[PDB]
Design a protein around this nucleic acid. Structure first.
Lengths: 182, 263
RNA sequence: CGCUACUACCGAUUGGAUGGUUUAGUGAGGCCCUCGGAUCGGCCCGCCGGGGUCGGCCCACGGCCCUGGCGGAGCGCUGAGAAGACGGUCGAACUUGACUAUCUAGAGGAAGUAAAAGUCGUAACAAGGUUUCCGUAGGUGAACCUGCGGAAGGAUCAUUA
RNA sequence: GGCGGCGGCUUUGGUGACUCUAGAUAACCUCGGGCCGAUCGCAGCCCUCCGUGGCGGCGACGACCCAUUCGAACGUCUGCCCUAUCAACUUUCGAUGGUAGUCGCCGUGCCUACCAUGGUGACCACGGGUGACGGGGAAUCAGGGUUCGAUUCCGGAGAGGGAGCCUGAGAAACGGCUACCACAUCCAAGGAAGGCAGCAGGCGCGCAAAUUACCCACUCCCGACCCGGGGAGGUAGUGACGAAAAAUAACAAUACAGGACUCUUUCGAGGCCCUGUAAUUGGAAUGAGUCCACUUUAAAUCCUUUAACGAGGAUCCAUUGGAGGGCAAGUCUGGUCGCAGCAGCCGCGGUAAUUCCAGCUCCAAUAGCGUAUAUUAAAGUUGCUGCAGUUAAAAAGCUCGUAGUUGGAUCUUGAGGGCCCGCCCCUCGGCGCCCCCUCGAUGUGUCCCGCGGGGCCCGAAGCGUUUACUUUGAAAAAAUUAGAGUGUUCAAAGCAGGCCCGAGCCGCCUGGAUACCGCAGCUAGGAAUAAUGGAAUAGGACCGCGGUUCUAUUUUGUUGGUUUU
RNA sequence: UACCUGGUUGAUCCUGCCAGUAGCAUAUGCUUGUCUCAAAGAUUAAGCCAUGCAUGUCUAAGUACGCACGGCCGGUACAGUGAAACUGCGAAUGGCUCAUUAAAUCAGUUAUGGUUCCUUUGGUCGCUCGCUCCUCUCCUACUUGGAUAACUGUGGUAAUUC
């Protein structure tokens, strides 16, 4: 019924300084393409302007407060914003990479079995982790505060604890047929 | 070509106060004709399997109406979509549960278990008082229940405690200033409280300045004013959401409370 | 002015095609109303089947009456009522021309653009060899020439006791 | 008390508003032609009493006659695209008004009888143009603005085009009919039978559009009705419309190539971050798959669940665009030689081609990317914000001059607390007054006073000239969209959700916010601002009253008479 | 995201359009692994439409005389069930499509005290208030009359839902 785009397109086609700046955020955080740059770029333009409009509203407006204190809380429940500052002036000062750190990928690179951020996207994509009682397969997942407290091995990752699929068995077959001579 | 009236009704272009969903089911219950105008009305099937949720399919609700377990206004109902309006009790004849249809100040129907003392009478603010043929006065209420021989001191907008066992009206409450009135409609839906003021105009379009229980004073027309008895004297219980008025910054303090606080 | 395409123009052919009207015509077609009586029953009476009564208390069958049958009878005089049909009513519509619009053929006319290296003269640019240009008016193969009044956008912001 | 005096009781439902309800009398009629059961199921009774008459529920259906519901259709206000190379229009045909009636569900020139000449326009009427269904809403733009609305909604309109009838409450029904007009069938030639802009599907047209699918289960719908039926709809298919998530392998080890580093005078060595590249892989994986299975739902289907299998490599191996600039990345390599081509534009190619054509390398995005066309911005090149008009486009030959659009000045409202308030130059409330049930003197009734109703007249208020304006609310389809609750595993999104108890918790529980309403109106605050009012050869306030006079009706018990206040 | 970029020329500053530049939404070029969503005969033919199908329906309660089915259980009419059939209602709506119409639709606001409405919600059902009782003789109330479907067969029909 209703759908929308979650990425964005700038009005300048070739702005090579920006084009290699977008190559950084992929290499700094482990992204697929510039769409993963443009996905958070699609969001953060709306976030600043929502911070801008509530700032230009008159104070003690519930549409400024009750929406905004939700928007204060929604940005803090995920742990991107901290509510120790908690006003619209600082929400004008947030960036893309505050969300990228709260993605599932970098927190796997920060914490757990990831040696690289190539590796950190793989462990989500090849489902070695459970973030809850949840095989979570999305690297752009952007996490909450409690979410960083239950990222484990998955029970479908047969290494680090899990039911065997066909791979540690194959890695057993590397010693039981790769070394068992049949 | 609109060669007759529509005998079909679909969803979302449906009343929102029935609290239906989006296009998940492509048809509406479509209440029948009856005592109340069709938007005031509420289907039983919304109250049965979408509010109390004892059923899940429509042919069951037909057979539940063939069970005849439903008495609306104390009267046996076999309609899945009965045109039941305001202050209409619903006697669920098998669970022993009475529920009187009143509106919230949130904007929703209240699943509201009144006492069975409060189920015999419902308060209908009257619709007309007319001297019928052969010199006979009458009262007819908003649910079009034509009652011969009214009270000889009542006038317009008096509330009759409509004996739902019989019709055949019992005692009244006179339309008086400062009565409790569940204000319904517009930005003042579901608000109970005293009247304290009424404004008059020849012709049409009279507004009624109502100060509710919370102190919200508002001028909203007498069409939005259904009298429910006497001032600071309710006659059924107060519905959910306090039935007066609620603020939304407080409503998040309400919505955080009993989720994960129960069981 | 030569090569030469594009394009509208215009155009005989009272070209053609399509659509919209419109005069009046015809009026379908049902509706209203006028009917109509194809026809179907009731009442009738003749006769018996029963009942009753006044052949008869044998008041009985039957006469008679009621009714059952039945037909005739006046088909009386009704109840119903068909097709048809009356005149209107709306009016499909079509006709007749008129009428317009759209589309297009259209010989060709006549041009512009394009199209360029084909041609004259040298318009005009330096004051461009007659400085420019307006209006207008003629002229001149043409660029244009001239007159009349302009103008400076000229080559003059500058001529005196 | 057969009355003459004098007094006394002295009596009608609603609307802002109808000649409203209601009343009555005189009736009226409706015929085949208003009405109050010749019915049907379920079931208990009483009988001076034996099989009937008295009779009671259950509900069937029905109608009298109305409320209702559903509304309908007509009438109010506000609102539409383009055109003056459309300026006046409308009736001979009623155009417009009245009266009168006809008719129609009814208002109505509806309609005519009849009368009137109306009615209306530069504020662009009248007319013409628009794929003009309209709107809810949609896309884009800082804002200002700009494009869309056949399109999951609302309302309208037609089912080939008209016309006419029908049925029913509702239909000129094209899943009626009748005929016509344009199409389509059988025909045995008489006749008979037909209209997908229903689902599909088909062709047709095109640039352009999927099942001649399945199910009445979900959704609802109609019924005599739980039952059923439904191409409504659901379901899948079709389906880079488009959208969402985001793979095609990491990872080290190795080595180098180093950047810190440490040693070293540096060198160099040690030294990791490593990342490319090497030979590799090493465990370590993963569906992309395949697949038992549970699942799924109308049945399914997919999904998710998966036992199990499915990567060391040139792999299970991404593309589509660009490098002459604009425009990122080839002053590559070859060929070509103003050729072939390329090049939106600016431009290469005429031989040592950075424009070709390729190779290679690079860049770009990426399961997309590119093109076409369309439109929005950029564009302050339509400039409302916010264009330019001496010489680049753009002040008329000049002037008056209407519409047009603009316009000069000018009238009054201290305290409380560290601003806030009312002030200054009758209908309510209500200080008073009398009446009345009277309140404290007094308990049909006074003198503390209407406070109760008032009545009147005040501070107060209809006030006095009003609006624009602003402000208040109401009203302001849903969807949309803004946006709250909400972990859709993120997300597109949905309206959700969360528990304890073993599973007897026989449950408990959050919810499903709020924002928006052209206008016109409404509402009520404001009264600045902009218009706006009056006393002019005198008018306004005061029962100043006066004399006149019309008439309205209460009491004189009543009526009647006249008479007055 | 409130932007510009390239192009007049000997060079320059302008005006000024050109062309690049993003959004889009079909058409399409090429290519495409998962998993969630899905527009889609509007453009062009409101074209013709083949075919498939798109509104049916019985309650304990209209009529059971099914040739049925099932039973002794039958008589006053009796069947349990019940095709049909007649009777009751929908069939008008739904879907589809926007050709059409320019104050017209439609939208917002109003009003029918001009108008009609199945259905449903509720009242209304003894009577002629006795013809100053036909309604006590009008004596049909324990109930009326005839008249059709299904049923049957005769059938005709190129063909027909004849």
């Amino acid at each position: 019924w209703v759908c929308r785009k979650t990425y964005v397109t700038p009005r300048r086609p070739f702005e090579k300084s920006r084009l290699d700046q977008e190559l950084k955020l992929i290499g700094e955080y482990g992204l697929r393409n510039k769409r993963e740059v443009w996905r958070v770029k699609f969001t953060l333009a709306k976030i600043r302007k929502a911070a801008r409009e509530l700032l230009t509203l008159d104070e003690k407006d519930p549409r400024r407060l009750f929406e905004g204190n939700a928007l204060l809380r929604r940005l803090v429940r995920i742990g991107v914003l901290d509510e120790g500052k908690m006003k619209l002036d600082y929400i004008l000062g947030l960036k893309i990479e505050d969300f990228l750190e709260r993605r599932l990928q970098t927190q796997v690179f920060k914490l757990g079995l990831a040696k690289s951020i190539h590796h950190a996207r793989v462990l989500i994509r090849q489902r070695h982790i459970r973030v809850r009682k949840q095989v979570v397969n999305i690297p752009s997942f952007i996490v909450r505060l409690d979410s960083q407290k239950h990222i484990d091995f998955s029970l479908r990752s047969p290494y680090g604890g899990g039911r065997p699929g066909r791979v540690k068995r194959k890695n057993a077959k590397k010693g039981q047929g790769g070394a068992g001579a049949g | 070509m609109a060669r007759g009236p529509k005998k079909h009704l679909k969803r979302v272009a449906a009343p929102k106060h029935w609290m239906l969903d989006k296009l998940t089911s492509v048809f509406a219950p479509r209440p029948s004709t009856g005592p109340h105008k069709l938007r005031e009305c509420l289907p039983l099937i919304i109250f049965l399997r979408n509010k109390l949720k004892y059923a899940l399919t429509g042919d069951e609700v037909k057979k539940i109406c063939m069970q005849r377990f439903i008495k609306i206004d104390g009267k046996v109902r076999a309609d899945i979509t009965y045109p039941a309006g305001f202050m209409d009790v619903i006697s669920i004849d098998k669970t022993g549960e009475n529920f009187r249809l009143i509106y919230d100040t949130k904007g929703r129907f209240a699943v509201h278990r009144i006492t069975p003392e409060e189920a015999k009478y419902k308060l209908c603010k009257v619709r007309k008082i007319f001297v019928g043929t052969k010199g006979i006065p009458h009262l007819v209420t908003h649910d079009a229940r034509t009652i011969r021989y009214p009270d000889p001191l009542i006038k317009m907008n008096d509330t009759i405690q409509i004996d739902l066992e019989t019709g055949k009206i019992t005692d009244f409450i006179k339309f008086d200033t400062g009565n409790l009135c569940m204000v319904t409609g517009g930005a003042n839906l579901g608000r109970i409280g005293v009247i304290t003021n009424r404004e008059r105009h020849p012709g049409s379009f009279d507004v009624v300045h109502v100060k509710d229980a919370n102190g919200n004073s508002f001028a909203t027309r007498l069409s939005n004013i259904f009298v429910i008895g006497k001032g600071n004297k309710p006659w059924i219980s107060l519905p959910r959401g306090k039935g007066i008025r609620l603020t939304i910054a407080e409503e998040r303090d309400k919505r955080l409370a009993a989720k994960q606080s129960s069981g």
